[PDB]
Amino acid sequence: NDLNVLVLEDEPFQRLVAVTALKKVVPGSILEAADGKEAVAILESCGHVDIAICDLQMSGMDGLAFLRHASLSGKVHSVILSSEVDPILRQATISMIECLGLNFLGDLGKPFSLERITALLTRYNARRLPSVADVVRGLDNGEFEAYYQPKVALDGGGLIGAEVLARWNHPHLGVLPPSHFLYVMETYNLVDKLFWQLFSQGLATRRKLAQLGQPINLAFNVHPSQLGSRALAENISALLTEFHLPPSSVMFEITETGLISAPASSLENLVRLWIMGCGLAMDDFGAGYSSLDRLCEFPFSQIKLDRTFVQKMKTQPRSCAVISSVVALAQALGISLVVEGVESDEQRVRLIELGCSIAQGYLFARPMPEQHFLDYCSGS
Amino acid sequence: MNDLNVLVLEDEPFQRLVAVTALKKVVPGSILEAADGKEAVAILESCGHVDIAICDLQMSGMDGLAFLRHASLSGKVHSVILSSEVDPILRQATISMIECLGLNFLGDLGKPFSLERITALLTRYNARRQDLPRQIEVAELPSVADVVRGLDNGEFEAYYQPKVALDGGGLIGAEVLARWNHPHLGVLPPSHFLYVMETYNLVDKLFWQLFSQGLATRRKLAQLGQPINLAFNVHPSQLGSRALAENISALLTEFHLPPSSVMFEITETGLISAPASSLENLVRLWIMGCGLAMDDFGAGYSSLDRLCEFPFSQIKLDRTFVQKMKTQPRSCAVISSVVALAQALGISLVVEGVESDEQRVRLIELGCSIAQGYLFARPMPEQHFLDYCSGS
Amino acid sequence: ETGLISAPASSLENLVRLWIMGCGLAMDDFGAGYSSLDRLCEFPFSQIKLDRTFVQKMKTQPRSCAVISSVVALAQALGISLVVEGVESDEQRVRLIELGCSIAQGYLFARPMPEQHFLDYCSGSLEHHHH
Amino acid sequence: NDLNVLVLEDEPFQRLVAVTALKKVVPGSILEAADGKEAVAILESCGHVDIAICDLQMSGMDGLAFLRHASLSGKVHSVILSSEVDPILRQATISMIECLGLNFLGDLGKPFSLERITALLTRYNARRLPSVADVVRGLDNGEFEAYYQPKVALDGGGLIGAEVLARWNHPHLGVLPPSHFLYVMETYNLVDKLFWQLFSQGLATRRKLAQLGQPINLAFNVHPSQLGSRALAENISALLTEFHLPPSSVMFEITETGLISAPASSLENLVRLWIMGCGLAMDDFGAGYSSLDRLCEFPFSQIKLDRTFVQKMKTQPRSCAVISSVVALAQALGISLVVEGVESDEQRVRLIELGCSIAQGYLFARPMPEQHFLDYCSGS
Amino acid sequence: MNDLNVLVLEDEPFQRLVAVTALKKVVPGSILEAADGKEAVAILESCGHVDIAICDLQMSGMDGLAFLRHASLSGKVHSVILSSEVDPILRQATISMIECLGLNFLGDLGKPFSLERITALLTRYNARRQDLPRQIEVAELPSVADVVRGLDNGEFEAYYQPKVALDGGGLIGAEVLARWNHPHLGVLPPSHFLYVMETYNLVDKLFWQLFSQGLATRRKLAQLGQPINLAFNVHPSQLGSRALAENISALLTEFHLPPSSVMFEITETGLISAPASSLENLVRLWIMGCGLAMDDFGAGYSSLDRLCEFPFSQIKLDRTFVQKMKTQPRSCAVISSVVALAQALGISLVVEGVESDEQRVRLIELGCSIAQGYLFARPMPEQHFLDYCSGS
Ligand SMILES: [Mg+2]
Ligand SMILES: [Mg+2]
Ligand SMILES: [Mg+2]
Ligand SMILES: [Mg+2]
């Protein structure tokens, strides 16, 4: 009311029947393409397209490449498939449409039953938690921004470094945390993609900080799956070069858990980064069995313990004992320890009493976007 | 409420009169009247919209349903009311069949046609009018005149669809099918001209154009050592002329072809609906030695008894049978009975509309042997067809 | 079959109640329309029956045999019973067995009888079977 | 919220599983019966039952008779069948539930899928145009009343007789005309039933009119299908006797159309009524071909022409010609003519000018319930 | 949000520890832990509700799925999370299978078990909590103790289900099935006790009670000239004892019965999961001359290779195969392959769960020959069964 449908249908009689069925039910314009090249030109100059329709059973490798064109244009919202999808590959097909960053509206067979074209229109406008399609589009569209949380010294004011955190400017929900997209990115293998957007932003921020005479070390989280990648280390350097920042300006964090399930060849990237001089933190330390055995076998330059140690100090003396033990450990290996989630002064002094040097939490600073951080940094 | 629009299809002038008189009293708007297909398609062409078509599903002078099919392609018709309240068991199937055409089923009128009942159906219509799909005047349904000129300007081409063995796809024969090389609409199947040709007695004209294009092709196959017989659809009206069989034989002789090189196909409904005088041509084609196929089979058995000797060498099962296999599995029982029938008569069985391999395997499982459909080969123009006939 | 064709619009209510109750339902004089195979498909009769002319035209008409065959297959594929009427002689009884028929009525077994004749027919038949 | 479900399930393990599945989703009470006798006793003392459930595939003739008990009690609204109904007899089964005056909510198979029990509950409460179930219940519950429209003389005030008209006191829609129920009654064969409720009411009204010294003849519409019935005439007399009213106090109307399609044996009832002395009108005269041939062959004592002749007089002189011809016809056979739908004085005088004696319309009186009519009658 | 409730089923103490440690950080509420079926059913019995069960679908020490089935009958469990992110092709089928139990599928946990991922699943749970069916403590799931006393008070009876030819219904044999004469709950099928008995090593006790009731019945059939063999389910655990075959033979001798009068049935999963030492009893039963059937078949072929000679005289197809025929027609291909398999091995095939005649006809069409199910006969107590065995 009024919609804008684009049908891709090669076979001319089929085209004829389809479009004619669409006139009856579809309030609004309708466009027509006899192949990929003609459809990609209807795109090359048109506004929004509410629904794209094409036939994946009949063709085939054209239909797929089209949908990508549909995807790349940024101009299409939803998809109806003009053949019935096989029950056994239903979810496969939907998921495939959604990794294009298109919404799957539905499917139906030629010649179209008119009641079925209504069902899907009603359903469509009825769409007026984020979906897979949403995440992919958000990512293909530079909506993801880097946030910054400082690692400060507990005693004094301090400013030692920062953890780069992923946030998403949602056009309707606003700023969101990883739990609302990492699932999707994790499941569909977009983590790498997000990583490189953020790593670039992060280095740009690192430059502005070097321009300002600030030794703020920027720490990035690396997903274990990336650790298996052939050229991660070689790509991190190429960018560190392109940006004229030195290795040591920068640090990569990997959880203890994720390090457990990491791919056979993870070490090839890890020796790289270590030699290079990049700092390497083992994050959420104390999560597996052999935590102490791990530090032994890999020269991590930092250890981080998480929100729960701090919270548990007061009510649970065993936490204090392990905080102290860890302090000793970092102390004896000559590396840094960051204690996360400090929210109160009580907590802060206790940590000092125990021996901890670095912290993060809402006491000092919540995660911040580039500018608020830069301002924060101009001040210590 | 407004200018409701009602088309009544009624063959029998006294029923028509009763119905129309009752409708005039109670219907706000125009009552249109058709006695036969010709009036009906004429009325349809001139109207912008027809809100309710009132239809009798068995007429002598008109095929009600075929008009509905044509009407559904027109864009112009909302709803259907049936004036025969018939056959309780088959009522749902009749509804769905109407509903798959694009059409909305309003109800049946009784053969009383009581005024009270009529207003019910109107209130009923009137409560649905908005929810119904827009009426548009679809330009893709060629007019009678427009069909009549195409047929006068040589733009109808024969296409050929192979009939093949279900295990393999080995070639056995082919059906010749009508396509319209429409000057500006592209290439049209029979949905877009056949019904008009039937209703204006232009089928005989189409058959002679296609039959000789086809003999040309059959000649080329012979020359290629390719013993593929070609089968042509004969519409029941064409059986009207006492000389059909003789004209067909003169033409076969003219093309240096024996009767056995060719087959003719008539629907079951067609064979049923033909006068004995007309049935005598099939007997003749049968004696000449042509193949004969009874087409769109599947409804029952009483067509077997029309003639002293069964002249048919082949039976073809209606396309809808393959589609219904999953949709309505009891139809597999009919496929079995028909397989059993053909075998017992020592004739062949073709099953049409075979599109997926899952259908192919089930058909083989039921005992089917010969098939046509998209799974094996689309209808082809001659040269594609000829090239197709090189691969064994 | 023809009766069902002309039946009143409410007929299905009674038929469905009978079916749901579990009484048998036979479609008699099967094949007298017009839509015979379609109709069987739309309602689950537990038995269909052939008119006696089918068996009579068996010598003259290979076609009659064919439709018997076809119907035998139809019933076996729907898992329902078929009764063939008009069995008047033994040679048509054996021909019917080659064709795959199983149940029959006809003069060869017994014309219609009043109760007591029928009971005595039944006793006798049971006695014959047990030897 | 909160519903009251009654499950009829013989097989005890099945009962166990069913009820347990119903606890999870059904907010409210649940009752249990191991057969018909125990269910008919849960009914014999309970309030409303929102949904009755029983299994029609497994049993059988018990399940049916139950539902009738459910029906007769007046206490149940809706039905879920506890087996899946066969696609081919879907409408048959639904229609069967609805002729019991129960609503078909839906069906499902044992053991119940929990999402399916939700779908149907949502659907059920979502029901909070009249249906078949509605008509049957309305009829089983004395909601249908007789209305009265007088046949007056055109010149003078006049009061000659009345046409008994069927109306339905709907508990939510209010007073409704035949078009909103005759379809249903016609389709499902309830016309007879409605007839006898109204005929009784009508005779009761006829007595009160005889008590008051009024020769108001009451005319009832007879459906053609009834005309085929073995004992219609014999039953009309038995009631005329039971009520001590004479045949001639009363008249039966049958349309010309319906008389055309009437059953072979319709005449057996028609000679009865004629001998008896009851008046017999041919209603909506002039609808077939052989109208004049009909009057010839059956001695109808009245002819009625409908709303459309009157309306057409002014703009269509041929109507006037046939009105006059009919006047002549009634005149020559010695019978009465009623002209229907007189709304205006102009219309009235014209009719007189033409020769018509009796009329009906909104000029004189719209159809009325027993009392307004009786009052109307006390006054002429 | 509240006291979430999470039960983790994990066999392997180091994975359990990793998972639990991660859950403690992030889950608001209690984390429950089970190493085996015993802990798991104990935890379940004491809990009022279990909001999320985290389950590993292949454990050595516990059948995860069987616990889920039992859990679904308990009323107490909302949702499932899987800790093996396995098998992409079979993922949908795995979901649906969970969903048909009553259960809600939340997602899979990775073998990382990342804290971020965990909170996603919790938010996800928390957004569904209301829409989910109420948790109630169903009293119909007999407790372990309660099962343990029934089994000590002789209230388990043998029932018999005929195996019959698909054309006709001619009698061929019968399976002996366990029923519980529950003092106050009525008559219960294995869903209500078997899983508990399996998990507390009480199956061996049930088998000896039923096996001798059954030999009694087999004796009565012999005496009646009724050569109906009776088949008994042997659970894999029972194969533990080196003397099973010898105990079974002593008992057969005691009842004046030859080994051939009897059959034993083990599931495919059972046969797969058994140590070779244990597989030696089947070899023994096979040599003694008992029938052997491999039960719930259909998954693949690698069970054929466990032993030097295939000791099985019969194969039975899993009940679900008949149900899937319409639902998923590709399963008809497996039925065909299994028919072909049995024939090639010269052994018999039973197909179970045959309820409608439309299934019966299709099974005959695929080549099946022997069947069990409601269409032919329900499980009967002895006398009904004996009376049933008079009619040929
Ligand atoms: Mg981190
Ligand atoms: Mg054909
Ligand atoms: Mg009247
Ligand atoms: Mg078994």
Side-chain angles (χ1 to χ4, degrees), chain E residues 313-336:
Chain E
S313 55
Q314 175 167 111
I315 282 175
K316 321 180 86 200
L317 256 202
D318 185 4
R319 157 181 289 278
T320 53
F321 284 102
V322 157
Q323 320 172 187
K324 290 188 339 183
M325 266 157 132
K326 266 3 128 181
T327 253
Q328 298 147 67
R330 289 166 65 85
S331 68
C332 290
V334 357
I335 292 162
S336 282

mmCIF file of all heavy atoms in Angstrom, chain E residues 313-336:
data_model
loop_
_atom_site.group_PDB
_atom_site.id
_atom_site.type_symbol
_atom_site.label_atom_id
_atom_site.label_comp_id
_atom_site.label_asym_id
_atom_site.label_seq_id
_atom_site.Cartn_x
_atom_site.Cartn_y
_atom_site.Cartn_z
ATOM 1 N N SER E 313 18.004 -64.043 12.307
ATOM 2 C CA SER E 313 17.042 -64.657 11.379
ATOM 3 C C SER E 313 15.951 -63.669 10.996
ATOM 4 O O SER E 313 15.183 -63.940 10.089
ATOM 5 C CB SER E 313 16.409 -65.922 11.989
ATOM 6 O OG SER E 313 15.811 -65.658 13.262
ATOM 7 N N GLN E 314 15.896 -62.519 11.666
ATOM 8 C CA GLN E 314 14.876 -61.529 11.415
ATOM 9 C C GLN E 314 15.345 -60.106 11.653
ATOM 10 O O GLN E 314 16.183 -59.833 12.533
ATOM 11 C CB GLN E 314 13.678 -61.793 12.302
ATOM 12 C CG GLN E 314 12.583 -60.754 12.225
ATOM 13 C CD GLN E 314 11.330 -61.260 12.880
ATOM 14 O OE1 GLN E 314 10.935 -60.775 13.923
ATOM 15 N NE2 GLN E 314 10.711 -62.250 12.282
ATOM 16 N N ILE E 315 14.782 -59.202 10.862
ATOM 17 C CA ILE E 315 14.984 -57.792 11.069
ATOM 18 C C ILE E 315 13.640 -57.080 11.254
ATOM 19 O O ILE E 315 12.652 -57.347 10.560
ATOM 20 C CB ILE E 315 15.685 -57.166 9.902
ATOM 21 C CG1 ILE E 315 17.156 -57.468 9.941
ATOM 22 C CG2 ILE E 315 15.681 -55.697 10.061
ATOM 23 C CD1 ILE E 315 17.845 -56.910 8.628
ATOM 24 N N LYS E 316 13.610 -56.160 12.196
ATOM 25 C CA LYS E 316 12.416 -55.367 12.357
ATOM 26 C C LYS E 316 12.705 -53.891 12.157
ATOM 27 O O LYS E 316 13.675 -53.332 12.661
ATOM 28 C CB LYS E 316 11.768 -55.645 13.712
ATOM 29 C CG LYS E 316 11.828 -57.086 14.116
ATOM 30 C CD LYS E 316 11.169 -57.282 15.445
ATOM 31 C CE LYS E 316 9.692 -57.498 15.309
ATOM 32 N NZ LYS E 316 8.957 -57.234 16.546
ATOM 33 N N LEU E 317 11.854 -53.273 11.368
ATOM 34 C CA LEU E 317 11.988 -51.844 11.032
ATOM 35 C C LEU E 317 11.338 -51.031 12.074
ATOM 36 O O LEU E 317 10.243 -51.335 12.526
ATOM 37 C CB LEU E 317 11.281 -51.516 9.733
ATOM 38 C CG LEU E 317 12.170 -51.322 8.544
ATOM 39 C CD1 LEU E 317 11.424 -50.523 7.569
ATOM 40 C CD2 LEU E 317 13.381 -50.555 8.976
ATOM 41 N N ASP E 318 12.017 -49.963 12.428
ATOM 42 C CA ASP E 318 11.520 -49.037 13.426
ATOM 43 C C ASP E 318 10.099 -48.458 13.115
ATOM 44 O O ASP E 318 9.838 -47.982 12.028
ATOM 45 C CB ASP E 318 12.581 -47.951 13.641
ATOM 46 C CG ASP E 318 12.217 -46.995 14.752
ATOM 47 O OD1 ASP E 318 11.161 -47.207 15.424
ATOM 48 O OD2 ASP E 318 12.986 -46.029 14.944
ATOM 49 N N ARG E 319 9.203 -48.534 14.093
ATOM 50 C CA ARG E 319 7.838 -48.035 14.018
ATOM 51 C C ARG E 319 7.702 -46.711 13.273
ATOM 52 O O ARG E 319 6.735 -46.484 12.550
ATOM 53 C CB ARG E 319 7.341 -47.864 15.457
ATOM 54 C CG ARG E 319 6.180 -46.877 15.685
ATOM 55 C CD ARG E 319 5.775 -46.757 17.196
ATOM 56 N NE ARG E 319 5.097 -47.952 17.711
ATOM 57 C CZ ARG E 319 3.792 -48.222 17.551
ATOM 58 N NH1 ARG E 319 2.992 -47.367 16.881
ATOM 59 N NH2 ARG E 319 3.269 -49.347 18.068
ATOM 60 N N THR E 320 8.650 -45.806 13.479
ATOM 61 C CA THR E 320 8.546 -44.485 12.914
ATOM 62 C C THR E 320 8.501 -44.551 11.397
ATOM 63 O O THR E 320 8.026 -43.615 10.767
ATOM 64 C CB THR E 320 9.750 -43.601 13.286
ATOM 65 O OG1 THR E 320 10.971 -44.272 12.940
ATOM 66 C CG2 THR E 320 9.715 -43.204 14.771
ATOM 67 N N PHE E 321 8.997 -45.629 10.805
ATOM 68 C CA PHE E 321 9.003 -45.727 9.347
ATOM 69 C C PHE E 321 7.660 -45.708 8.661
ATOM 70 O O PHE E 321 7.541 -45.145 7.597
ATOM 71 C CB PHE E 321 9.788 -46.916 8.859
ATOM 72 C CG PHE E 321 11.232 -46.710 8.935
ATOM 73 C CD1 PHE E 321 11.970 -47.271 9.967
ATOM 74 C CD2 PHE E 321 11.880 -45.954 7.959
ATOM 75 C CE1 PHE E 321 13.370 -47.068 10.021
ATOM 76 C CE2 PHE E 321 13.259 -45.752 8.007
ATOM 77 C CZ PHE E 321 14.014 -46.301 9.038
ATOM 78 N N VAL E 322 6.668 -46.324 9.268
ATOM 79 C CA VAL E 322 5.325 -46.269 8.730
ATOM 80 C C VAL E 322 4.730 -44.851 8.822
ATOM 81 O O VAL E 322 3.994 -44.423 7.933
ATOM 82 C CB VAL E 322 4.390 -47.333 9.401
ATOM 83 C CG1 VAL E 322 2.898 -46.939 9.274
ATOM 84 C CG2 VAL E 322 4.601 -48.651 8.782
ATOM 85 N N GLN E 323 5.054 -44.124 9.885
ATOM 86 C CA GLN E 323 4.426 -42.829 10.121
ATOM 87 C C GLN E 323 5.008 -41.852 9.124
ATOM 88 O O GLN E 323 4.315 -40.995 8.620
ATOM 89 C CB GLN E 323 4.678 -42.340 11.543
ATOM 90 C CG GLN E 323 4.603 -43.451 12.683
ATOM 91 C CD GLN E 323 5.067 -42.937 14.074
ATOM 92 O OE1 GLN E 323 5.190 -43.716 15.033
ATOM 93 N NE2 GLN E 323 5.326 -41.623 14.181
ATOM 94 N N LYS E 324 6.274 -42.033 8.788
ATOM 95 C CA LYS E 324 6.962 -41.108 7.937
ATOM 96 C C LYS E 324 6.609 -41.296 6.487
ATOM 97 O O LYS E 324 6.886 -40.430 5.703
ATOM 98 C CB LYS E 324 8.484 -41.235 8.110
ATOM 99 C CG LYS E 324 9.043 -40.748 9.447
ATOM 100 C CD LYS E 324 10.594 -40.731 9.485
ATOM 101 C CE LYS E 324 11.180 -41.664 8.425
ATOM 102 N NZ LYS E 324 12.669 -41.783 8.430
ATOM 103 N N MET E 325 6.016 -42.421 6.114
ATOM 104 C CA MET E 325 5.663 -42.657 4.713
ATOM 105 C C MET E 325 5.002 -41.478 4.005
ATOM 106 O O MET E 325 5.375 -41.155 2.870
ATOM 107 C CB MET E 325 4.763 -43.859 4.573
ATOM 108 C CG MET E 325 5.478 -45.125 4.284
ATOM 109 S SD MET E 325 4.457 -46.511 4.797
ATOM 110 C CE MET E 325 4.605 -47.478 3.355
ATOM 111 N N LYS E 326 4.030 -40.828 4.645
ATOM 112 C CA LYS E 326 3.337 -39.718 3.976
ATOM 113 C C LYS E 326 4.088 -38.465 4.265
ATOM 114 O O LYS E 326 4.410 -37.718 3.377
ATOM 115 C CB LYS E 326 1.864 -39.611 4.393
ATOM 116 C CG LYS E 326 0.840 -40.363 3.449
ATOM 117 C CD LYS E 326 1.481 -41.183 2.260
ATOM 118 C CE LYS E 326 0.994 -42.648 2.189
ATOM 119 N NZ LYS E 326 1.616 -43.444 1.076
ATOM 120 N N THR E 327 4.400 -38.285 5.530
ATOM 121 C CA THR E 327 5.148 -37.181 6.095
ATOM 122 C C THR E 327 6.477 -36.890 5.392
ATOM 123 O O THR E 327 6.808 -35.722 5.148
ATOM 124 C CB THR E 327 5.355 -37.503 7.613
ATOM 125 O OG1 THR E 327 4.513 -36.657 8.387
ATOM 126 C CG2 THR E 327 6.751 -37.315 8.085
ATOM 127 N N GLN E 328 7.246 -37.948 5.099
ATOM 128 C CA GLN E 328 8.532 -37.853 4.394
ATOM 129 C C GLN E 328 8.734 -39.060 3.474
ATOM 130 O O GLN E 328 9.335 -40.046 3.882
ATOM 131 C CB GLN E 328 9.671 -37.792 5.403
ATOM 132 C CG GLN E 328 9.626 -36.591 6.316
ATOM 133 C CD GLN E 328 10.182 -36.909 7.696
ATOM 134 O OE1 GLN E 328 11.395 -37.183 7.862
ATOM 135 N NE2 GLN E 328 9.300 -36.878 8.700
ATOM 136 N N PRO E 329 8.214 -38.991 2.237
ATOM 137 C CA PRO E 329 8.254 -40.089 1.254
ATOM 138 C C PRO E 329 9.641 -40.692 0.882
ATOM 139 O O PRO E 329 9.711 -41.789 0.314
ATOM 140 C CB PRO E 329 7.563 -39.485 0.024
ATOM 141 C CG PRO E 329 7.576 -37.988 0.248
ATOM 142 C CD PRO E 329 7.459 -37.830 1.724
ATOM 143 N N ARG E 330 10.731 -40.025 1.225
ATOM 144 C CA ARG E 330 12.049 -40.578 0.908
ATOM 145 C C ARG E 330 12.341 -41.764 1.774
ATOM 146 O O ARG E 330 13.196 -42.581 1.468
ATOM 147 C CB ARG E 330 13.149 -39.521 1.005
ATOM 148 C CG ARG E 330 13.088 -38.503 -0.127
ATOM 149 C CD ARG E 330 13.961 -37.299 0.179
ATOM 150 N NE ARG E 330 15.368 -37.696 0.232
ATOM 151 C CZ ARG E 330 16.183 -37.798 -0.825
ATOM 152 N NH1 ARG E 330 15.757 -37.508 -2.051
ATOM 153 N NH2 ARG E 330 17.449 -38.172 -0.647
ATOM 154 N N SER E 331 11.593 -41.867 2.862
ATOM 155 C CA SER E 331 11.666 -43.010 3.766
ATOM 156 C C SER E 331 11.130 -44.279 3.110
ATOM 157 O O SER E 331 11.439 -45.386 3.547
ATOM 158 C CB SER E 331 10.909 -42.706 5.076
ATOM 159 O OG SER E 331 9.493 -42.595 4.865
ATOM 160 N N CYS E 332 10.333 -44.135 2.070
ATOM 161 C CA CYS E 332 9.940 -45.304 1.318
ATOM 162 C C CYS E 332 11.147 -45.935 0.633
ATOM 163 O O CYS E 332 11.197 -47.136 0.452
ATOM 164 C CB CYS E 332 8.864 -44.962 0.302
ATOM 165 S SG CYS E 332 7.249 -44.580 1.060
ATOM 166 N N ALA E 333 12.146 -45.131 0.304
ATOM 167 C CA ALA E 333 13.323 -45.675 -0.304
ATOM 168 C C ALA E 333 14.073 -46.512 0.721
ATOM 169 O O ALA E 333 14.510 -47.627 0.407
ATOM 170 C CB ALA E 333 14.181 -44.595 -0.839
ATOM 171 N N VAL E 334 14.175 -46.042 1.960
ATOM 172 C CA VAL E 334 14.787 -46.904 2.905
ATOM 173 C C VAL E 334 14.036 -48.200 3.123
ATOM 174 O O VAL E 334 14.675 -49.254 3.275
ATOM 175 C CB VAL E 334 15.364 -46.217 4.201
ATOM 176 C CG1 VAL E 334 15.223 -44.741 4.166
ATOM 177 C CG2 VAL E 334 14.811 -46.818 5.440
ATOM 178 N N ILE E 335 12.706 -48.165 3.098
ATOM 179 C CA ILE E 335 11.937 -49.395 3.305
ATOM 180 C C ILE E 335 12.308 -50.373 2.197
ATOM 181 O O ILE E 335 12.556 -51.549 2.453
ATOM 182 C CB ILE E 335 10.388 -49.128 3.378
ATOM 183 C CG1 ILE E 335 10.027 -48.342 4.660
ATOM 184 C CG2 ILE E 335 9.584 -50.445 3.326
ATOM 185 C CD1 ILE E 335 8.643 -47.650 4.612
ATOM 186 N N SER E 336 12.391 -49.872 0.968
ATOM 187 C CA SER E 336 12.804 -50.692 -0.165
ATOM 188 C C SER E 336 14.199 -51.292 0.025
ATOM 189 O O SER E 336 14.413 -52.453 -0.301
ATOM 190 C CB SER E 336 12.827 -49.875 -1.441
ATOM 191 O OG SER E 336 11.539 -49.699 -1.947
#
